Scaffold this active site. Structure first.
Site, PDB file in Angstrom:
ATOM      1  N   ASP A  30     -25.344 -26.071 -42.139  1.00  0.00           N
ATOM      2  CA  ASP A  30     -25.835 -26.491 -43.433  1.00  0.00           C
ATOM      3  C   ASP A  30     -25.798 -28.007 -43.510  1.00  0.00           C
ATOM      4  O   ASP A  30     -25.026 -28.660 -42.814  1.00  0.00           O
ATOM      5  CB  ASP A  30     -25.016 -25.872 -44.535  1.00  0.00           C
TER       6      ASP A  30
ATOM      7  N   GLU B 103       0.817  -1.214   0.000  1.00  0.00           N
ATOM      8  CA  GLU B 103       0.000   0.000   0.000  1.00  0.00           C
ATOM      9  C   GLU B 103       0.850   1.263   0.000  1.00  0.00           C
ATOM     10  O   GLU B 103       0.470   2.271  -0.604  1.00  0.00           O
ATOM     11  CB  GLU B 103      -0.912  -0.018   1.232  1.00  0.00           C
TER      12      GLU B 103
ATOM     13  N   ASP C  74      -7.929   4.477  -0.252  1.00  0.00           N
ATOM     14  CA  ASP C  74      -6.658   3.920   0.184  1.00  0.00           C
ATOM     15  C   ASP C  74      -5.469   4.780  -0.225  1.00  0.00           C
ATOM     16  O   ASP C  74      -4.424   4.252  -0.614  1.00  0.00           O
ATOM     17  CB  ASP C  74      -6.525   2.487  -0.319  1.00  0.00           C
TER      18      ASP C  74
ATOM     19  N   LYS D 126     -11.384  -7.422 -10.599  1.00  0.00           N
ATOM     20  CA  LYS D 126     -11.300  -6.451  -9.517  1.00  0.00           C
ATOM     21  C   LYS D 126     -11.123  -5.044 -10.047  1.00  0.00           C
ATOM     22  O   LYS D 126     -11.663  -4.098  -9.476  1.00  0.00           O
ATOM     23  CB  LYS D 126     -10.139  -6.792  -8.581  1.00  0.00           C
TER      24      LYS D 126
ATOM     25  N   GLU E 211      -6.959   3.551  -5.160  1.00  0.00           N
ATOM     26  CA  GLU E 211      -7.120   2.276  -4.488  1.00  0.00           C
ATOM     27  C   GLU E 211      -5.934   1.379  -4.820  1.00  0.00           C
ATOM     28  O   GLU E 211      -5.156   1.654  -5.734  1.00  0.00           O
ATOM     29  CB  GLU E 211      -8.431   1.616  -4.898  1.00  0.00           C
TER      30      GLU E 211
END
Ligand SMILES: [Zn+2]
Ligand SMILES: [Zn+2]
Lengths: 1612, 49
Positions: free
Chosen positions: A1193, A50, A88, A114, A101
């Site tokens: 066909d 992060e 975030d 996601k 994010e």
């Protein structure tokens, strides 16, 4: 609890640099307990990645992880009452802010699912936040592994390699389905084997819903009926059928009655109801103007190029955007052109009459910058107005072209030459005529087209070519280009866009129009004979459907004379049918529409129904289409007027029926000349959706929104299950309700049970068993910038600029340095326009919105009087504003026009400024940028900016700490959406989405379903599974070529043998059948593998077509608002408006099978059921059928014992075939003369040539990258066009259309270019490699200059072969280059220096010399990677004629130049070397200034000789012998006969001879192969190995005897 | 020989003279005798009687 001591010291090596890791680790070390160790000491690895994407972009990470509504309230901003999300990482300033994010995935399958959910979750935050008065910039961060910088990539795998045991120990020492998806998320880099067993190891839970499925879905099937009980059913059934429903008249077929059809067709076609005229030219609107051109002028100069030269300098001087707007940089070079015009008036006595009405200016007209006719006098007003507005205008811009500017100019005085207004009035009063008029919104005299001689009709097509070319390059005009004068009976034309087009040596015409773009226009055409103007009318069309005729007089007259010459058996019939075909051919091109395409398609069903002997009963009620206008009748009287003419007269008009058949089938395909484009897409998608939805609500099954993950409510379910048991209803013996979907379940029982026994011709044996980037959203397909890209690259550009002026503190944007960012990553003032003009209008109108919202974002980045009521705020401004919710999406049609002028016309305040200031400092763009259109003449965009300015937008939790389905959002790397426990209908993760599109086929729109990424993966399993199942079958032909070939070989011998061969088809074979039918077939199959003779389990397939039963088909968003404004689909919407009024966006179904999804899984169903019906006729009607199937066909050829008495067989077959919802369309035909199979119509005794598909496909498919690549595709299609024996002459005239379209493209010529002319035998024996030798040896026509390089090739080739080495190390001597390798080889073979003197002086100018022609390692690598690894034409030809005249050729030094500068860089060398072929072959002395481009042609002639010796012959060497009557129309079949001097099986041998050529090139990316592999890697024009790794791929050529006795001969 | 119908006109069954390699009717025999003696289906001459 065995690694619990190791773990605290393992991750002590991450220094808490901030407050982000410091409180995290002090609560980690103080808790020795595995109950919060694997939640709170696990949340640091999510906290660690992060920080990486917040250290990367400009960001402040949320260390509190709290709401958005109060992160704005710490500033002084009122509460907007937002939706509830947790961001975030942010970065806020002023009134804009950056959400980011963060999530990391490994596999591609659940990474995009996601991204698509997160982006949909953020882009549904604006709608409450746009109302807050603030815009945001959203980004996402995709990571495909762990690539942190704050750790060193050696401790993070120890985490997931030593915590991988600690949870197994933690839940073995001490929650169920939140466990192994956590394993698959915490697993390693998964190069994971995915297959049928991937389904096998899940949970397979239940719902108490699937039992009610099986209660209707497996019940009647037992599948083990005894094989002597079925016969006693079938004889009773036939005896019931014949006595019950036949003789009282319900049969579908009949006896065709060959007189009634021709009376039926006249009543079909000759619209005696309508009131159209007899003359063809009068009704159509463009054939009128063509007839006015071709009989107003057929019955009957250094200042010119000086004017062209300085105007062509004006063209390049416009494309800079240096004069701070786009208005005075029109008027300035207007002033230049008018001063230079009067500067010719003072030179000669007569120049403005004799050389200017003969060229470029008609009566009160002037030609200038873009293409604008300007018609003098309004300039004289505007120039005087400009010098009135600024007193001294040309004193700074007079030579601002020096500073901050090129300062390369030739404008001597006309920069500063102030035009004497008292001088131009003499000229303006000299030439005056009537101003151009252009029509919007009764007798006849047209000389009766059949009564014009056989020469001046070519003067119709020749004029159609010259008008059509001006139609074509009427796109080339700039798409931005606002005019100088803005503003419906008939308009006199002040100034307009225009083209020119030449007819003879005195006169031109014109072509006037008002709108730019690719859409429809409203033209008009004038003439100018010797200065006098003459109007000739007005018509109304769209350009891009007219690519076809553009240079093709001789094409469209070679095939319309090739075709008439078929009828030299009745001369008096031929001289009638001739000039009535040609008006047809003209009229079709002159009118491309869908209706006069579809009707011309619908005549090959008639024609088989007239030669054969039984048609379906409903066909004449389907050949009709309503002629919507009075131009589709002109074709529907001349095709029908041809069919009545030569099919059947009242006499014995069937002398030679075969040529009549060929000649009329080629008219039914002569349809195909209309370009397949679906003329508008917002009227196409509605027809596509309405063709999808009609067979569904008629049976009544369609639903509204499912939940997309498993569960269905009961009311939604019950209509599903009712459709299910209504599907399997269908009792076996009722003649009502026969055209209805479903299957008779008791009959499918017989069908599968006789398959269990081994008595069908197929059997369940099953060899080698089967058991082993940008991704779009799904509501808009067919478009090229979906919604999700178009904010993504904007927000990325915002972040890329928001940092770069906070690295230093510029705080001012250069308005092109903000248009360099978008305009690069979508696809230095010359660089921008170098790559700006290579767009399309579709992208231009997106680019402008991108410029808009980028600059609005940056204007919001730096910020911290409504009393103009002429038209009221009260119900006009605020009303439309709140209805549309944006200023951005404002329409123009709520007001009039002049209010846009006058509400703009408030005076200056603090809202405006002057001095337009291209420095443009930030914090002033909200008042600077509006002045850019206050000063430019346009108004509406200024209205939008003035409107956007003025504020007008308004312990329990320890048990819950372990991952519950509420504790999903605690991690980024949790992988919430992983497949964990599949259900009967879903896969615990999704609901198998889809999407809509059409296919742009010839007659009708074929649909096409877009799948998502998991859906393709789960469809490949079933499709390849059933492909392996059908691999062991015997009669399918979809993917196997060989069985298709056997069927063709059967049909050929069987029509010659007196059989009765049907030809079926199936109306909506796609949208009728159901996945539940495939479930009900796979319940009772056996499929015993011969390895282990056992009934295998297909539960890997039986549990996954249950998923295919329950797909979620979306709807197009363009029809989500097109039915919203205002037709049974629209009735279907506006009865789902009367419910809870949600918009109907998701449709689960029962019976889809969209075409191309479960495709081969219905090909065996059309083989299993076909063989079951094929057995029902061996026992009930004592014949022996055989029944192929290509999944759409069929053909079932029948022998008969010992003539259409046995209609009884065929109708009864139809009644059975209706019982399995294989319906038979009324398009089918059954007889004994004609049979088709996949459009290969197999008449008695022959094959039908079908000329007019190949020409009509060859005139298209002009695709443009490099002008040799474009002369490869057309050489291939000319190989196919002579595979069916057309002639030489039409091939020899496609090869001038393709040639002149290159010569028109600025390229000049080169000796390779387009392919040759007058080529006769080199189609059968030899590739492009043989023909380029014939092109180059056509130059040396005395053949005294290249026989000696063939002598050298003889001396080398007999010695470089086997039995001898003799410098097999020549891999280096070619790699020197091209100038000296021939000097190596020739003096190797040996002659004087004087031979090298008389050889190396021949030079051709290359342009792909150093690099290649650039228009935004040889081709050998990019070809061999393709063996290793696995929009209209007429808007894709203008980008080849706009980015070829520009700076596009390169040197080895870094840079580019023009072509003309090269072609100005050449001398004149009259001394017999250049006078061999001018501008093709040069001297060596004449290339003295530019000598880095002169390569010899003799080098590549020797290169081709030594390649063609590898690939065939020892007769590339001999002297070409002199060639040596029959009827024109006797052709027969030939074979290649090529004598190949290699050994075969080259599929691998080429790569293992690239070590012995170049080690680094194989590093990064036989007996005679290697000598001719370096003769390919050094240039581009050879192309050898693509014709050795494959084969010739036709080998069956048919040629005319009068094109085969005339050809030459080269023996040995 | 091949199939028993007419090679040219396809819709006749009786009274057929066997030509060189193809069947043929008395009707369309006469619309080839006036143009040539050489045929235009097999490009080889045909029986006279
Ligand atoms: Zn006949
Ligand atoms: Zn014949």
């Amino acid at each position: 609890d065995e690694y619990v001591q190791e773990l605290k010291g393992l991750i002590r090596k991450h220094i808490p640099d901030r407050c982000e890791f410091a409180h995290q680790k002090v609560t980690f070390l103080s808790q020795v307990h595995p109950s919060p160790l694997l939640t709170e000491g696990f949340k640091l690895l999510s906290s660690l990645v992060e920080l990486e994407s917040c250290e990367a972009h400009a960001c402040q990470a949320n260390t509190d992880q709290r709401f958005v509504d109060v992160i704005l309230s710490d500033n002084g901003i009122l509460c907007p009452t937002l939706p509830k999300v947790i961001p975030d990482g942010f970065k806020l300033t002023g009134k804009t802010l950056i959400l980011l994010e963060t999530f990391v995935r490994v596999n591609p399958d659940e990474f995009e699912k996601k991204w698509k959910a997160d982006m949909s979750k953020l882009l549904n935050l604006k709608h409450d936040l746009q109302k807050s008065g603030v815009t945001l910039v959203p980004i996402v961060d995709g990571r495909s592994n762990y690539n942190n910088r704050f750790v060193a990539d050696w401790v993070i795998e120890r985490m997931r390699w030593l915590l991988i045991e600690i949870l197994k120990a933690s839940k073995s020492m001490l929650e169920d389905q939140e466990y192994q998806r956590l394993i698959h998320s915490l697993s390693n880099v998964k190069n994971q084997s995915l297959g049928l067993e991937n389904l096998e190891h899940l949970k397979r839970n239940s719902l108490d819903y699937d039992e009610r499925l099986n209660e209707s879905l497996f019940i009647g099937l037992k599948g083990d009926i005894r094989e002597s009980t079925v016969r006693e059913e079938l004889i009773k059934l036939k005896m019931w059928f014949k006595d019950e429903v036949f003789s009282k008249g319900l049969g579908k077929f009949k006896l065709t009655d060959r007189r009634e059809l021709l009376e039926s067709l006249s009543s079909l076609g000759a619209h005696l109801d309508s009131d159209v005229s007899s003359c063809p030219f009068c009704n159509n609107k463009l054939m009128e103007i063509v007839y006015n051109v071709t009989f107003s002028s057929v019955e009957r100069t250094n200042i010119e190029k000086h004017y062209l030269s300085v105007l062509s300098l004006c063209n390049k001087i416009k494309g800079l955007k240096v004069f701070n707007t786009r208005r005075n940089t029109l008027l300035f070079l207007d002033l230049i052109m008018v001063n230079l015009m009067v500067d010719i008036s003072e030179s000669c006595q007569d120049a403005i009459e004799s050389l200017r009405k003969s060229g470029l200016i008609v009566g009160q007209m002037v030609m200038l910058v873009n293409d604008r006719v300007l018609d003098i006098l309004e300039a004289i007003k505007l120039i005087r107005k400009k010098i009135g507005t600024n007193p001294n205008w040309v004193k700074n811009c007079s030579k601002i072209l020096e500073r901050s500017h090129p300062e390369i100019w030739l404008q001597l005085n006309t920069l500063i030459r102030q035009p004497d207004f008292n001088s131009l009035i003499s000229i303006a009063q000299y030439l005056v005529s009537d101003r151009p008029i252009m029509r919007y919104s009764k007798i006849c005299r047209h000389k009766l087209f059949q009564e014009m001689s056989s020469f001046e009709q070519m003067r119709l097509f020749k004029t159609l070519s010259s008008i059509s070319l001006s139609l074509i390059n009427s796109m080339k005009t700039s798409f931005s280009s606002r005019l100088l004068v803005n503003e419906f009976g008939n308009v006199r034309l002040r100034e307009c866009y225009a083209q020119r087009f030449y007819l003879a040596e005195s006169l031109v015409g014109f072509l006037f129009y008002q709108k730019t773009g690719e859409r429809s226009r409203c033209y008009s055409v004038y003439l100018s004979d010797n200065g006098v103007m003459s109007e000739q009318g007005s018509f109304y069309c769209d350009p891009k459907r007219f690519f076809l005729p553009v240079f093709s007089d001789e094409v469209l007259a070679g095939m319309c004379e090739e075709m008439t010459s078929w009828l030299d058996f009745d001369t008096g019939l031929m001289n009638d049918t001739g000039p009535i075909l040609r008006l047809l051919v003209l009229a079709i091109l002159c009118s491309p529409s869908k209706r006069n395409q579809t009707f011309l398609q619908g005549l090959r069903y008639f024609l088989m129904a007239f030669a054969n002997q039984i048609h379906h009963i409903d066909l004449i009620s389907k050949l009709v289409v309503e002629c919507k206008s009075s131009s589709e009748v002109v074709v529907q009287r001349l095709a029908v007027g041809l069919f009545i003419r030569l099919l059947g007269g009242e006499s014995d008009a069937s002398s030679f029926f075969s040529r009549r058949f060929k000649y009329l089938l080629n008219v039914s395909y002569l349809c195909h000349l209309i370009t397949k484009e679906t003329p508008d897409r917002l009227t196409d998608q509605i027809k596509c959706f309405e063709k999808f939805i009609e067979p569904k609500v008629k049976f009544g099954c369609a639903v509204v929104n499912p939940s997309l993950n498993g569960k269905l409510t009961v009311d939604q379910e019950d209509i599903m299950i009712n459709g299910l048991k209504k599907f399997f209803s269908k009792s076996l013996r009722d003649t009502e309700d026969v055209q209805t979907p479903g299957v008779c379940k008791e009959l499918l029982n017989y069908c599968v049970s006789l398959f269990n026994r081994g008595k069908l011709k197929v059997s369940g044996e099953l060899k080698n068993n089967p058991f082993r980037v940008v991704i779009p959203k799904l509501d808009e397909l067919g478009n090229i910038l979906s919604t999700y890209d178009k904010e993504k690259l904007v927000s990325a550009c915002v972040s890329s600029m928001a940092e770069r002026f906070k690295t230093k503190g510029r705080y001012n944007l250069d308005p092109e340095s903000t248009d360099y960012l978008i305009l690069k990553n979508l696809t230095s003032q010359e660089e921008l326009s170098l790559m700006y003009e290579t767009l399309t209008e579709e992208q231009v109108e997106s680019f402008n919105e991108i410029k808009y919202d980028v600059q609005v974002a940056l204007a919001k980045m730096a910020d911290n009087s409504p009393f103009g009521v002429m038209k009221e705020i009260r119900a006009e401004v605020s009303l439309h504003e709140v209805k549309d919710f944006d200023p951005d999406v404002l329409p123009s049609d709520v007001y009039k026009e002049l209010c846009d002028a006058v509400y703009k016309s408030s005076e200056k305040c603090n809202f405006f400024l002057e001095e337009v200031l291209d420095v443009c400092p930030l914090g002033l763009l909200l008042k600077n940028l509006t002045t850019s259109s206050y000063m430019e003449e346009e108004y509406f965009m200024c209205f939008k900016y003035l409107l956007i300015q003025g504020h007008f937008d308004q312990a329990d939790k320890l048990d819950k700490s372990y991952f519950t389905n509420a504790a999903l959002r605690n991690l980024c790397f949790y992988s919430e959406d992983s497949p964990t426990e599949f259900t009967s209908i879903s896969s615990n993760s999704g609901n198998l989405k889809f999407g809509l599109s059409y296919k742009e086929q010839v007659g009708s729109n074929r649909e096409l379903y877009v799948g998502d990424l998991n859906t393709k993966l789960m469809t490949r399993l079933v499709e390849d599974f059933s492909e392996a199942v059908g691999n062991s079958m015997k009669y399918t032909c979809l993917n196997s070529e060989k069985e298709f070939e056997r069927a063709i070989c059967d049909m050929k011998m069987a029509v010659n043998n007196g059989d009765l061969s049907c030809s079926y088809d199936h109306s909506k074979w796609g949208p009728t059948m159901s996945p539940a039918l495939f479930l009900a077939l796979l319940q009772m199959l056996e499929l015993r593998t011969p390895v282990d003779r056992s009934k295998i389990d297909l539960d890997s397939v039986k549990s996954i077509l249950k998923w295919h039963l329950h797909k979620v088909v979306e709807v197009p968003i363009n029809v989500a608002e097109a039915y919203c404004i205002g037709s049974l689909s629209e009735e279907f919407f506006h009865q789902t408006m009367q419910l809870s009024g949600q918009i109907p966006s998701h449709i689960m179904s029962v019976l889809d099978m969209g075409q191309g999804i479960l495709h081969n899984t219905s090909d065996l169903y059309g083989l299993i059921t076909e063989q079951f019906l094929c057995y029902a006729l061996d026992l009930l009607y004592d014949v022996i059928p055989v029944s192929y199937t290509s999944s759409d066909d069929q053909i079932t050829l029948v022998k008969t014992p010992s003539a259409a008495e046995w209609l009884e067989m065929i109708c009864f077959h139809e009644f059975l075939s209706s019982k399995l919802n294989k319906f038979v369309s009324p398009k089918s035909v059954i007889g004994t003369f004609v049979a088709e199979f996949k459009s290969r119509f197999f008449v008695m005794g022959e094959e039908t040539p079908l000329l007019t598909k190949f020409v009509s496909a060859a005139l298209h498919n002009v695709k443009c990258k490099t002008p040799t690549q474009l002369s490869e595709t057309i050489d291939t299609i000319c190989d196919q066009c002579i595979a069916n024996g057309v002639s030489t002459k039409i091939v020899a005239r496609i090869s001038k259309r393709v040639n002149q379209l290159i010569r028109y493209s600025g390229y000049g010529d080169t000796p390779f270019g387009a392919i040759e002319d007058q080529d006769v035998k080199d189609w059968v024996d030899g590739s492009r490699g043989y023909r380029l030798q014939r092109k180059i040896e056509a130059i040396f026509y005395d053949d005294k200059e290249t026989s000696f390089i063939r002598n050298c090739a003889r001396k080398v080739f007999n010695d470089i072969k086997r039995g001898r080495i003799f410098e097999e190390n020549l891999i280096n001597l070619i790699g020197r280059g091209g100038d000296e390798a021939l000097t190596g080889f020739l003096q190797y073979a040996g002659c004087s220096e004087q031979e090298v003197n008389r050889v190396l002086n021949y030079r051709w100018v290359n342009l792909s010399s150093f690099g290649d022609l650039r228009l935004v390692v040889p081709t050998l690598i990019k070809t061999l990677q393709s063996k290793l690894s696995r929009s209209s034409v007429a808007s894709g030809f203008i980008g080849f004629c706009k980015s070829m005249g520009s700076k596009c050729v390169r040197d080895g030094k870094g840079g580019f130049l023009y072509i003309k500068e090269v072609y100005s860089g050449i001398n004149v060398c009259i001394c017999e070397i250049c006078a061999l072929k001018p501008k093709i072959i040069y001297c060596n002395d004449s290339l003295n200034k530019v000598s880095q481009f002169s390569k010899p042609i003799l080098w590549d002639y020797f290169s081709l000789v030594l390649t063609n010796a590898c690939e065939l012959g020892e007769w590339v060497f001999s002297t070409v012998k002199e060639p040596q009557l029959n009827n024109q129309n006797f052709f027969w079949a030939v074979k290649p006969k090529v004598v190949r001097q290699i050994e075969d099986q080259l599929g691998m041998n080429h790569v293992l001879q690239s070590i012995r050529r170049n080690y680094p090139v194989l590093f990064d990316e036989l007996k005679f192969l290697d000598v001719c592999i370096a003769l390919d890697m050094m240039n581009e024009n050879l192309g050898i190995i693509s014709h050795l790794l494959k084969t010739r791929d036709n080998s069956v050529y048919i040629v005319k005897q009068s094109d085969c006795a005339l050809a030459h001969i080269r023996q040995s | 020989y091949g199939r028993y119908n007419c090679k040219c006109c396809w819709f006749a069954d009786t009274n057929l003279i066997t030509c060189n390699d193809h069947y043929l009717c008395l009707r369309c025999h006469q619309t080839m005798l006036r143009n040539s003696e050489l045929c235009h289906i097999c490009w080889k001459p045909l029986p006279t009687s």
